[PDB]
Design an enzyme around this catalytic site. Structure first.
Site, PDB file in Angstrom:
ATOM      1  N   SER A  11       0.426  26.771 -26.230  1.00 56.31           N
ATOM      2  CA  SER A  11      -0.779  26.950 -25.429  1.00 56.31           C
ATOM      3  C   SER A  11      -1.197  25.557 -25.009  1.00 56.31           C
ATOM      4  O   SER A  11      -1.192  24.647 -25.815  1.00 56.31           O
ATOM      5  CB  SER A  11      -1.900  27.636 -26.219  1.00 56.31           C
ATOM      6  OG  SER A  11      -2.269  26.899 -27.369  1.00 56.31           O
ATOM      7  N   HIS A  36       2.448  29.331 -22.459  1.00 53.99           N
ATOM      8  CA  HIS A  36       1.368  30.316 -22.577  1.00 53.99           C
ATOM      9  C   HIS A  36       0.148  29.695 -21.889  1.00 53.99           C
ATOM     10  O   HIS A  36      -0.378  28.700 -22.376  1.00 53.99           O
ATOM     11  CB  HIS A  36       1.139  30.607 -24.058  1.00 53.99           C
ATOM     12  CG  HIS A  36       0.037  31.590 -24.326  1.00 53.99           C
ATOM     13  ND1 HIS A  36       0.249  32.949 -24.368  1.00 53.99           N
ATOM     14  CD2 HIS A  36      -1.282  31.403 -24.589  1.00 53.99           C
ATOM     15  CE1 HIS A  36      -0.907  33.563 -24.606  1.00 53.99           C
ATOM     16  NE2 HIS A  36      -1.854  32.648 -24.728  1.00 53.99           N
ATOM     17  N   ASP A  38      -3.606  29.999 -20.588  1.00 56.21           N
ATOM     18  CA  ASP A  38      -4.849  30.757 -20.834  1.00 56.21           C
ATOM     19  C   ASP A  38      -5.773  30.663 -19.664  1.00 56.21           C
ATOM     20  O   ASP A  38      -6.309  29.609 -19.379  1.00 56.21           O
ATOM     21  CB  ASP A  38      -5.586  30.201 -22.049  1.00 56.21           C
ATOM     22  CG  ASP A  38      -4.885  30.498 -23.321  1.00 56.21           C
ATOM     23  OD1 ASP A  38      -4.634  31.681 -23.590  1.00 56.21           O
ATOM     24  OD2 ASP A  38      -4.588  29.564 -24.089  1.00 56.21           O
ATOM     25  N   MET A  40      -9.268  31.896 -18.101  1.00 59.75           N
ATOM     26  CA  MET A  40     -10.570  32.400 -18.490  1.00 59.75           C
ATOM     27  C   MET A  40     -11.529  32.295 -17.302  1.00 59.75           C
ATOM     28  O   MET A  40     -11.643  31.232 -16.687  1.00 59.75           O
ATOM     29  CB  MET A  40     -11.075  31.584 -19.677  1.00 59.75           C
ATOM     30  CG  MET A  40     -10.082  31.549 -20.870  1.00 59.75           C
ATOM     31  SD  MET A  40     -10.762  30.528 -22.312  1.00 59.75           S
ATOM     32  CE  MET A  40      -9.315  30.624 -23.563  1.00 59.75           C
ATOM     33  N   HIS A  71      -2.072  34.451 -19.983  1.00 64.51           N
ATOM     34  CA  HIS A  71      -3.004  35.145 -20.827  1.00 64.51           C
ATOM     35  C   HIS A  71      -4.306  35.329 -20.031  1.00 64.51           C
ATOM     36  O   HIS A  71      -5.163  34.450 -19.994  1.00 64.51           O
ATOM     37  CB  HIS A  71      -3.229  34.368 -22.116  1.00 64.51           C
ATOM     38  CG  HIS A  71      -4.085  35.100 -23.097  1.00 64.51           C
ATOM     39  ND1 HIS A  71      -4.291  34.659 -24.379  1.00 64.51           N
ATOM     40  CD2 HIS A  71      -4.779  36.250 -22.972  1.00 64.51           C
ATOM     41  CE1 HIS A  71      -5.134  35.483 -24.987  1.00 64.51           C
ATOM     42  NE2 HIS A  71      -5.441  36.460 -24.151  1.00 64.51           N
ATOM     43  N   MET A  73      -7.722  36.342 -19.553  1.00 61.68           N
ATOM     44  CA  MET A  73      -9.021  36.662 -20.162  1.00 61.68           C
ATOM     45  C   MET A  73     -10.022  36.684 -19.032  1.00 61.68           C
ATOM     46  O   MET A  73     -10.850  35.794 -18.865  1.00 61.68           O
ATOM     47  CB  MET A  73      -9.355  35.639 -21.247  1.00 61.68           C
ATOM     48  CG  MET A  73      -8.512  35.859 -22.527  1.00 61.68           C
ATOM     49  SD  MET A  73      -8.590  34.352 -23.746  1.00 61.68           S
ATOM     50  CE  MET A  73      -7.313  33.201 -22.873  1.00 61.68           C
ATOM     51  N   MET A 142      -4.487  39.180 -30.824  1.00 58.92           N
ATOM     52  CA  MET A 142      -5.264  37.954 -30.986  1.00 58.92           C
ATOM     53  C   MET A 142      -5.713  37.774 -32.413  1.00 58.92           C
ATOM     54  O   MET A 142      -6.068  38.727 -33.096  1.00 58.92           O
ATOM     55  CB  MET A 142      -6.444  37.883 -30.017  1.00 58.92           C
ATOM     56  CG  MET A 142      -5.942  37.566 -28.602  1.00 58.92           C
ATOM     57  SD  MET A 142      -7.342  36.995 -27.525  1.00 58.92           S
ATOM     58  CE  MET A 142      -7.372  35.140 -28.276  1.00 58.92           C
ATOM     59  N   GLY A 150     -13.366  26.245 -31.919  1.00 59.15           N
ATOM     60  CA  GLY A 150     -13.068  25.939 -33.332  1.00 59.15           C
ATOM     61  C   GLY A 150     -13.096  27.146 -34.258  1.00 59.15           C
ATOM     62  O   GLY A 150     -13.819  27.167 -35.259  1.00 59.15           O
ATOM     63  N   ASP A 176      -1.898  34.887 -31.296  1.00 61.60           N
ATOM     64  CA  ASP A 176      -2.508  33.815 -30.514  1.00 61.60           C
ATOM     65  C   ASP A 176      -3.895  33.536 -31.054  1.00 61.60           C
ATOM     66  O   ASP A 176      -4.758  34.386 -30.944  1.00 61.60           O
ATOM     67  CB  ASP A 176      -2.557  34.218 -29.044  1.00 61.60           C
ATOM     68  CG  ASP A 176      -3.264  33.170 -28.148  1.00 61.60           C
ATOM     69  OD1 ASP A 176      -3.418  31.988 -28.544  1.00 61.60           O
ATOM     70  OD2 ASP A 176      -3.635  33.545 -27.033  1.00 61.60           O
ATOM     71  N   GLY A 177      -4.064  32.375 -31.696  1.00 60.42           N
ATOM     72  CA  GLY A 177      -5.355  31.942 -32.253  1.00 60.42           C
ATOM     73  C   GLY A 177      -5.196  31.260 -33.600  1.00 60.42           C
ATOM     74  O   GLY A 177      -4.973  31.931 -34.596  1.00 60.42           O
TER      75      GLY A 177
HETATM   76 ZN   LIG Z   1      -3.868  32.739 -25.127  1.00 61.14          ZN
END
Ligand SMILES: [Zn+2]
Ligand SMILES: [Zn+2]
Lengths: 225, 225
Positions: A11, A36, A38, A40, A71, A73, A142, A150, A176-177
């Site tokens: 990521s 990957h 992300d 958002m 990904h 979101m 996830m 964090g 993922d996370g």
């Molecule tokens: Zn992701």
């Protein structure tokens, strides 16, 4: 079974976003299997990262070979299917929670020439992926609440990964996370074979070594299956 | 009056977004007075560009001196004030159409240590800026409809710029949308003193030359006022 054997997808959000092409090349040169990315939109999650215009620049720079897993979101995934395909994404991972018509969306992703990913947030029961498992390329469980800063890796998500692995032995399952050298053991033993990791790779002088470690821990669990 | 001199702020959406820092450094090395960063959340406009995490990487690469003007084409501008101030943005330009309480947002922006910009889209009457002109650092009269690729410069926006300049001789007035060497005369004569331009500067072989031309045309108008 036909589950893909272990894949590591870095990521890039904790990377230098002002030099994202060079960072991606560094990930690929360190042995990343996929990238990957992300996305958002500030609505589905409380953060805004980047959209298809960044993806298109990345594709022009890196060429056709590297595999981009988006990904998404975003609250209207239907809206970005075509722009992402035109931008050059390979896989469109949307959230079950962001549409009322997952079936039609899967068809549209495919009609646009992309692979299909389906993700679920921690509060969403794993049972809700079941009707779609055989119709997707990859499922994403996830392991943090997305969009927050964090977040610790959530060990209590592993029963969802194990349940998916048990019911769909040939499904590719991503985590993922907060996944790193320490948490990857739990992810692999539970059944995940697609590993997303960010800061654990980006913090290292030797990202190849960290990716190797992730792949090797993943493989040692997968060969026992 | 106290209208600022002429300032040129390249827009970077047609830049190589996979090398955004290098692209910003090239603009700055070419005499850019500021950097105009278009933030789109995919709701207020049908596009997702980038958010505060990319601004934070940009600020870390370029250092504290360059000035970042954030063109916030987002539906909830209240939400990104603090994140943008922490990322290192200097000016936060929000859209009058994106809020029902511009007064409180203006205060919040200033509490977070940033300069204040206020933008209106083509369909929005310029009269709606008037109650706020003295309370902001810069007004933005958009000269294309935001969110769509390849829009023609709208000559019919010039009367909004002129009305603003007449009513508020000390206000800094920005134009944004298809502005370039061929349309800059019209923007200057109408009264604009902050000029955002994209491709015309970005894809040039002599971007210093193009920035100089834009500022020079703008000054010739400003001298006659
Ligand atoms: Zn992701
Ligand atoms: Zn703009």
């Amino acid at each position: 079974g036909m589950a893909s054997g272990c894949k590591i997808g870095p990521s890039i959000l904790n990377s230098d976003l002002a030099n994202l092409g060079a960072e991606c090349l560094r990930m690929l040169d360190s042995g990343a299997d996929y990238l990957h990315l992300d996305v958002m939109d500030g609505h589905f999650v409380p953060n805004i990262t980047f959209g298809h215009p960044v993806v298109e620049s990345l594709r022009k720079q890196l060429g056709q070979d590297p595999f981009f897993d988006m990904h998404m979101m975003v609250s209207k995934p239907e809206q970005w299917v075509k722009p992402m395909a035109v931008a050059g994404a390979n896989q469109y991972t949307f959230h079950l929670e962001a549409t009322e018509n997952p079936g039609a969306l899967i068809k549209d992703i495919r009609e646009n020439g992309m692979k299909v990913g389906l993700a679920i947030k921690p509060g969403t029961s794993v049972e809700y992926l079941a009707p779609w498992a055989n119709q997707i390329d990859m499922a994403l469980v996830m392991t943090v609440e997305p969009g927050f800063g964090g977040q610790k890796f959530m060990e209590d998500m592993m029963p969802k990964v194990h349940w998916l692995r048990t019911q769909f032995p040939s499904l590719d399952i991503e985590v993922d996370g907060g996944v790193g050298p320490d948490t990857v053991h739990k992810c692999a033993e539970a059944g995940a074979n697609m590993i997303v990791s960010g800061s654990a790779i980006m913090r290292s002088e030797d990202p190849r070594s960290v990716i190797n470690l992730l792949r090797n821990v993943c493989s040692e669990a997968a060969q026992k299956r």
